Design a protein around this ligand. Structure first.
Ligand SMILES: Nc1ncnc2c1ncn2[C@@H]1O[C@H](COP(=O)(O)OP(=O)(O)O)[C@@H](O)[C@H]1O
Ligand code: BEF
Lengths: 622, 93, 80, 76, 93
DNA sequence: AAAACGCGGGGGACAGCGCGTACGTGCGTTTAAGCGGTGCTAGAGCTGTCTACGACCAATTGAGCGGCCTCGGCACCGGGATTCTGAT
DNA sequence: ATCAGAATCCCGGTGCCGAGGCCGCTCAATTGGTCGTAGACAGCTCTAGCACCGCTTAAACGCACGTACGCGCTGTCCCCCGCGTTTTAACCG
């Protein structure tokens, strides 16, 4: 409402000691501020005397203090080492690059005309910038916007005067026109190089749509299921003129991947990402509908499970023609509030995507089938027939493809289990938690993995040397991890480590920081932006990171991890399907390195039982 | 049914059953359960009436903890009856 | 921190405002944690005694209600 | 709505019960009852304490105020 | 399974006193626990009184004295009156 | 033996006035926490069998209750020593 | 710094009532047996409330600022003490 400091970009010396004082900062150093309710590119150099008394000064002090401490421990501190400065200028340049890209627009929302002090009815563009949700969206000058990105303004104009709007979407639900078995890429798909199996899947799902019933894309993780989804959305919106809104609900951390896929295989098609705070939602409500007492313009709306649950009611009004769920494994619980919410959603056709269709128990497969098609769905020898008749019944409604039969270029997958000996400290903790007075199966798992997980196990085993020797020698699992990490570093390989516990990941991060390896971490507590930065860095052509720390399912459900060769699973997650789904994060079609999977198991512990019983779940897949 | 013939809404028979099974005395009079059911019905009717009045004052068709607690605490009578009592999810007067 | 400090200064604040307190002294908070601490010791002691008698390894809402009823503040809502 | 704060209260209750017994395993309803009772007690006590301050010609409650309230209640 | 609660009866009284209003599971639990508390209190009083009078039976006059002691006043007369109408009409049939 | 009136008198109430510690109040961060969702498996909560346990009943008797009767011990008194108390 | 004047206090004397013992014979105790059935025990199926992790975001923490009130000090003047004196209600045969 009133101009004032909101974010600060960077610093500099106005004109050419260890701890700058307040006067030293105020006079010599000068700061590039952003003003509130302004674009992120309308920045300006500023100094205390010029800004005067204005809100945000506390943030000017907080950033300046961060700058002073940074200048203290870059090199003028007594302790200086090459790794330290490397991390400092690395984080510095990353922050610079992110803020530099915060300037350029990503999309334009609307154009409005307003009289200025001079009376000109100059046009103004509301513009969303890259790496921002629709919150903090400002009306920028039309002239500046067209100069800065004429291409985006062209896409904007095409969007507002688009021949693909929902409002005259055809209504073929009375009888769906019969299709023709496609043998070539339709010219609509502007990504190119669609695979033969992907065409077969598109035609399978089109035949199923035409017949009217629904199905689950059960192709195993890493066969371009997202690309098939985008191709079929374009197919509905072009071949069948069903312009009307579609909803894609995807796990978070894969939403940017879905924007990339939609834009690169269908640039003309409009998609709206639906996340951010309540202001982001409100700025979406400003645009997704018209100010009138109703039509949808957005061709597709992308969102996540949490946002579906939160805005169930408000989205529930919108007549959806195609609702597609990615990674249909959170829909395996009938009681799940997402299950109830999606049933409550008013949807013409539902599609499910999952690398792993059949989960731990047949009840989950039954629940998935029922939510696909509601109302349409022991002794050993009777069971042997019954499973097969249920399977035969669902084969027309399921499509699954194996990486071995098709995509021969995908190198074979090798998985190996390494039985590890429990160290002395782990054994001691183990016997302690088989009794009381050391001062649940979880505690066995923690003790088997690594004793630092416990509250005050630091003193029990324990300069720079001492901490590292303690951490390595405390777990035989970690000792084998050292041998493999050094071997892979010698071989120039890249690794990603799947740990169930966030504390396991924290222990790994402290270890790798101490030993000096550069890594990248992705976890549930990580905000969406910096997760995307993490994935972009690890996937860039140049990558000084050799280790990717991951949870079992935050980065092991739907994320893309091109350019990794080794997957080290610390422990099974009680679900072999989820273990496989994490394992297929490096066995994508885009891998020419013959991924090898090392699963670490402690001997004479709970993990042997865990594997022996996950074996039962594997046998039930048949 | 003893309650239905009684024209009281409370179970005279089950009150008698609990008085027998509660080790209260070896024999229970015929009129004691009847009288106790009558007083229980009366107190419930009074409290429910007050709760409904509070709900009307709050323009709500639904009687919630705050309605019941507000009734009990505004009314001096029930307040002295249940002064050293706390109603779950109940707000302050 | 230790979970006695889990009862946060804003929580103590909201309690006081509900009870009608206009201002709270900084020394109030420690002692509120203290009285909360001793009351919980009493009620949990009676509840655990109830379970131990019942050969039940799970504190039950009926046990909590019975404990409170003896201490002199009957709790309605969780009856069974 | 409830104001003594859920998970902090549950953990406080857990360590309090830890001293009286080990491998003791609460119920959700039991935790709710405990929190509601403690809420009621503390609101009553702050009402008393504010009476005490108002009688001492003070608007801000004090340690001495809450100790007065307690030692007239009698648990102290 | 058969659960010991005053559900249907509180519903019946509530529809009698306020036909439009309804009560949910939680508030029924509040009413049920309250009625159980009042009823336990009255029955304990009656048993204690029969004991102190060395009388080994319970009856409407026991409950008379219990209700009169427990209810603070200005519903004591009402509770006595409705209980008495119930017990005379019982002893008739 | 206690209550009730009355007088002067000291002590302290109550109000005012000042200063300064402490308080509430933003300002946003970092924190943690609903409110979903995972996989357990401790341990209910329930049933069924069968034993020792306990409730009633005579028959036998020995601890308790009321009545009765002594005499230590407590309350009582005067007189004598102890004592905390201003008052100047 | 001191000692006079009330109250408190030490001892022991005499008188009276209740405590504590004894006695009888009342009543319920204590074996001794029998029968029924409540609980211990064993066993099963199934609940539900762990342990943690997402994810968003309300809430808590820290810090800084300004000023309303806590506590102290002083001053005056109402309102009780603390007798002495005069009623008065009570005292226990
Ligand atoms: N034909 C293709 N051309 C280019 N990239 C592809 C193709 N097929 C798949 N990919 C890439 O593979 C990645 C993974 O797709 P997939 O694992 O099947 O689904 P999801 O992305 O939902 O996990 C996508 O991010 C996509 O970029
Ligand atoms: F197919 Be996986 F979920 F990327």
């Amino acid at each position: 409402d009133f101009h004032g400091i909101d974010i600060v970009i960077n610093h500099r010396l106005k004109t050419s000691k260890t701890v700058p004082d307040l006067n030293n900062c105020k006079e010599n150093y000068e700061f590039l501020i952003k003003w509130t309710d302004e674009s992120h590119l309308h920045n300006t150099w500023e100094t205390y005397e010029s800004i005067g008394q204005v809100r945000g000064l506390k943030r000017l002090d907080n950033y300046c203090k961060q700058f002073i401490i940074e200048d203290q421990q870059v090199r003028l501190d007594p302790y200086v080492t090459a790794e330290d400065i490397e991390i400092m200028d690395m984080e510095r340049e990353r922050r610079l690059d992110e803020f530099e890209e915060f300037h350029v627009p990503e999309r334009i929302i609307d154009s409005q005309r307003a009289s200025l002090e001079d009376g000109t009815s100059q046009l103004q563009y509301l513009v969303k910038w890259r790496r921002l949700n629709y919150d903090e969206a400002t009306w920028e000058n039309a002239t500046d916007i067209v100069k800065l990105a004429p291409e985006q303004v062209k896409h904007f104009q095409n969007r507002e005067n688009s021949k693909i709007l929902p409002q005259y979407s055809s209504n073929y639900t009375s009888q769906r026109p019969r299709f023709e078995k496609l043998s070539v890429q339709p010219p609509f798909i502007k990504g190119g190089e669609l695979r033969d199996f992907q065409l077969t899947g598109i035609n399978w799902m089109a035949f199923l749509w035409s017949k009217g019933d629904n199905g689950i894309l059960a192709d195993e993780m890493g066969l371009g299921k997202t690309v098939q989804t985008v191709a079929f959305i374009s197919w509905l919106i072009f071949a069948r003129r069903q312009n009307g809104p579609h909803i894609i609900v995807v796990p978070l951390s894969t939403m940017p991947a879905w924007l990339d896929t939609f834009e690169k295989w269908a640039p003309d098609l409009n998609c709206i990402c639906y996340m951010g705070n309540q202001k982001s939602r409100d700025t979406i409500r400003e645009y997704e509908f018209y100010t009138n007492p109703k039509t949808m313009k957005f061709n597709v709306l992308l969102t996540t499970y949490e946002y579906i649950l939160k805005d169930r009611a408000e989205l529930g009004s919108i007549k959806w023609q195609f609702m597609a769920v990615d990674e249909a494994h959170r829909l395996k619980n009938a009681e799940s509030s997402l299950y109830e919410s999606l049933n409550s959603f008013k949807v013409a056709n539902r599609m499910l995507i999952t690398g792993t269709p059949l989960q731990n128990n047949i009840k989950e497969l039954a629940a998935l089938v029922n939510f696909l098609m509601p109302g349409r769905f022991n002794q050993d020898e009777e069971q042997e027939e019954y499973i097969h008749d249920l399977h035969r019944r669902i084969q027309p409604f399921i499509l699954r493809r194996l990486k071995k039969d098709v995509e021969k270029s995908l190198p074979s997958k090798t998985e190996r289990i390494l039985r590890v000996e429990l160290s002395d400290v782990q054994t001691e903790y183990y016997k302690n938690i088989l009794t009381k007075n050391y001062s649940i199966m979880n505690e066995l798992k923690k003790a088997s993995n690594h004793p630092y997980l416990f509250d005050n196990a630091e003193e029990r085993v324990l300069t720079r040397e001492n901490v590292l020797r303690g951490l390595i020698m405390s777990s035989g699992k970690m000792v084998l991890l050292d041998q493999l990490l050094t071997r892979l570093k010698k071989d120039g390989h890249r690794v990603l480590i799947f740990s169930q516990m966030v504390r396991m990941l924290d222990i790994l991060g402290d270890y790798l920081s101490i030993k000096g390896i550069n890594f990248q971490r992705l976890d549930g507590t990580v905000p969406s932006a910096q997760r995307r930065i993490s994935i972009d860095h690890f996937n860039s052509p140049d990558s000084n990171d050799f280790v990717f720390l991951l949870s079992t399912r935050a980065g092991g459900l739907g994320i893309n991890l091109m350019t990794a060769d080794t997957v080290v699973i610390f422990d099974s997650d009680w679900n072999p399907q989820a273990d496989l789904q994490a394992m297929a994060r490096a066995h994508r079609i885009g891998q020419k390195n013959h991924v090898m999977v090392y699963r670490l198991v402690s001997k004479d512990t709970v993990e042997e039982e865990v594997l022996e019983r996950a074996r039962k779940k594997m046998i039930l897949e048949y | 049914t003893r309650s239905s013939r009684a024209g009281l809404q409370f179970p005279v028979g089950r009150v008698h059953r609990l008085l027998r099974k509660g080790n209260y005395a070896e024999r229970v009079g015929a009129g004691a359960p009847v009288y106790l059911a009558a007083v229980l019905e009366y107190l419930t009717a009074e409290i429910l009436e007050l709760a409904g009045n509070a709900a009307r004052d709050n323009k709500k068709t639904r009687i919630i903890p705050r309605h019941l607690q507000l009734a009990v605490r505004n009314d001096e009578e029930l307040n002295k009856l249940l002064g050293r009592v706390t109603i779950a999810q109940g707000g302050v007067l | 921190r230790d979970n006695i400090q889990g009862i946060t200064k804003p929580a103590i604040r909201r309690l006081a405002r509900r009870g009608g307190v206009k201002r709270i002294s900084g020394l109030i908070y420690e002692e509120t944690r203290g009285v909360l601490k001793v009351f919980l010791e009493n009620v949990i002691r009676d509840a655990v005694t109830y379970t131990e008698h019942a050969k039940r390894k799970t504190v039950t809402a009926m046990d909590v209600v019975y404990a409170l009823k003896r201490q002199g503040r009957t709790l309605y809502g969780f009856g069974g | 709505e409830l104001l003594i704060r859920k998970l902090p209260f549950q953990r406080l209750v857990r360590e309090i019960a830890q001293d009286f017994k080990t491998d003791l395993r609460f119920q959700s309803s039991a935790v709710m009852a405990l929190q509601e009772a403690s809420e009621a007690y503390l609101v009553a006590l702050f009402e008393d304490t504010n009476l005490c301050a108002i009688h001492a010609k003070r608007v801000t409650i004090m340690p001495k105020d809450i100790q007065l309230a307690r030692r007239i209640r009698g648990e102290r | 399974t058969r659960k010991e609660s005053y559900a249907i009866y509180v519903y019946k009284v509530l529809k009698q006193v306020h036909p439009d209003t309804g009560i949910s599971s939680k508030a029924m639990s509040i009413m049920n626990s309250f009625v159980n508390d009042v009823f336990e209190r009255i029955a304990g009083e009656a048993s204690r009184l029969a004991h102190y009078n060395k009388r080994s039976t319970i009856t409407s006059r026991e409950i008379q004295t219990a209700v009169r002691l427990l209810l603070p006043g200005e519903l004591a007369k009402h509770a006595v009156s409705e209980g008495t109408k119930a017990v005379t009409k019982y002893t008739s049939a």
